[PDB]
């Protein structure tokens, strides 16, 4: 089985950990416990092929911003997560995208743009806006809810597919 190194990045509190734990354990985490760095493994069959996913769950808090280079080097693919009820987190995406390109010295890095918390009505980032950004990056845009599971498998397994064809 092929092993895939996935890395989940984005501003603090957007739901990177909730997304990952929903995928791993089918459980929604209600608490907000800021991550430093967590690792998860998942054996899963995608498009009829058994995969081993290593998922690195990273820190969004700005106080940890000097330690990003370190995990960006190892990652094969990146979930760039913002929250659709948080405009600042959307504006933060651009910085993650550029740092990843910088670190891996490539314009061709497997990536998925993720708009999380789509279960909430109070949206402030419009889908069209995020979609335009994704297109400018050449990557898919998927809206998710770690709470309901909407889009969660789609987001992660779409990233796997991009690594696969890379």
């Amino acid at each position: 089985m092929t092993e895939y190194k996935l890395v989940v990045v984005g501003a603090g509190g957007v739901g990177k950990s909730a997304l990952t734990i929903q995928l791993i354990q089918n459980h929604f985490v209600d608490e907000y416990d800021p991550t430093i760095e967590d690792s998860y493994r998942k054996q899963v069959v995608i498009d009829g092929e058994t995969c081993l996913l290593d998922i690195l769950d990273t820190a969004g808090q700005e106080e940890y911003s000097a330690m990003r280079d370190q995990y960006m080097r190892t990652g094969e693919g990146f979930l760039c997560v913002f929250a659709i009820n948080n405009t600042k987190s959307f504006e933060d995406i651009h910085q993650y995208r550029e740092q990843i390109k910088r670190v891996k010295d490539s314009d061709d890095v497997p990536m998925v743009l993720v708009g999380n918390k789509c279960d909430l009505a109070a949206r402030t980032v419009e889908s069209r806006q995020a979609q335009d950004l994704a297109r400018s990056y050449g990557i898919p845009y998927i809206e998710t809810s770690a709470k309901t599971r909407q889009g969660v498998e789609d987001a992660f397994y779409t990233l796997v597919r991009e690594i696969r064809q890379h």
């Binding site: 929903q22 608490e31 760095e37 998942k42 054996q43 058994t50 690195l56």
Partner: protein, 468 residues
Amino acid sequence: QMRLPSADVYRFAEPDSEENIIFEEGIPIIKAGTVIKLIERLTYHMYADPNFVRTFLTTYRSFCKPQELLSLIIERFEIPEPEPTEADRIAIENGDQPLSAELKRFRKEYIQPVQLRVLNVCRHWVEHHFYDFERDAYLLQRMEEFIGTVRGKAMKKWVESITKIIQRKKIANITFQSSPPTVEWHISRPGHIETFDLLTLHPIEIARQLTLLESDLYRAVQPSELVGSVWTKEDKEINSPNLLKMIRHTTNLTLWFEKCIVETENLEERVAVVSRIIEILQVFQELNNFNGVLEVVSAMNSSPVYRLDHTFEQIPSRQKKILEEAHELSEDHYKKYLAKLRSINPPCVPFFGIYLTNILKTEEGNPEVLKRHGKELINFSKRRKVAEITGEIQQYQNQPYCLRVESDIKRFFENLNPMGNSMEKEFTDYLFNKSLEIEPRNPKPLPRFPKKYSYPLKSPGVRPSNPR
């Protein structure tokens, strides 16, 4: 490259040498080291390796006491800051604000990463290895004090978080993805627990409820029950109670299958019993319940059952094939089982026995220390091997089954006690004597026996039904 504090004031700044650390031949893999070097690398400023954190916290007790680990990481946390440089000195002497470029860099690239990584060790320790604290209240007090008195705005978010996490842990929901299938009923109807039995429950629902039970038992086993091979030692009931409960369920189910078979003296009825057990095996296979599969295979290869040639003769060839394929999983040291486990889509229930043997042999067959240049180094590669096994175990413990519990059927199998009040040898001798009775050794001819079941023997089959 950053200058470090002197090794005399901060021990974790000793240079790497083959006298304190050895690497395996994009981060290094440690073969061996002193505790100091292991802890430095556990919290290294240059890179993250959360898997190292899990490996270390799972296995460290074989070379470092929990109280000593806490002292060492607190020591690691307390990093001296450098004094102002010559350029800084000159600025200060002229009444200007120093650039403090080197101090700022050291804070940003050494101190803050190392301190955050110490805090991540504390976080993982509390979240995933809380038993150290459960078994030693004073260790917990020390941790609470340490975390509770970390000052500075940089660590503040995580310090407050870890304080809350500890408090939560001291006083201590699934989403799918589709609804579970409808519970299936056969001769025994809902609520009629008195009638529950191998043939009267639906074979589909027998396999499902046993899979839920065996999945819960599998998922309950902690690494603390495994490291140091403690399930094999004198205090195994104290240290490995979940593992042993899981194994005893497996053993009891296997013995129940054997009992159901040899206590069915009539050949025709016994064929129906065996055929129903192979049907349950088929559903275990569909559910990726490998523990359940091997439960059945073990029963069919047992001395009392294996030798029942007349029963074997009448089992449909398609069921013979299913059983033989299941058995082939275990052949050649579980070659096909291992390939199958690594290929399926979870949820599954692994066979635990293979893990136990590999953990035991890894621990017995490798030395605790490596001796190099007159020094004793901790053999960390041995611990990494053990942690790779516990890590694989944990990976299969994550995925829950989308199946509805049936409380009465669950209880029926929880309370299964085929041996009754008899000891193992006498029950085991009993089963084999029953076997000899119902199918005597050659050249004794086969006797006939009366039927015992008053209800139909025809199976409802193992394909699920679905009303609107």
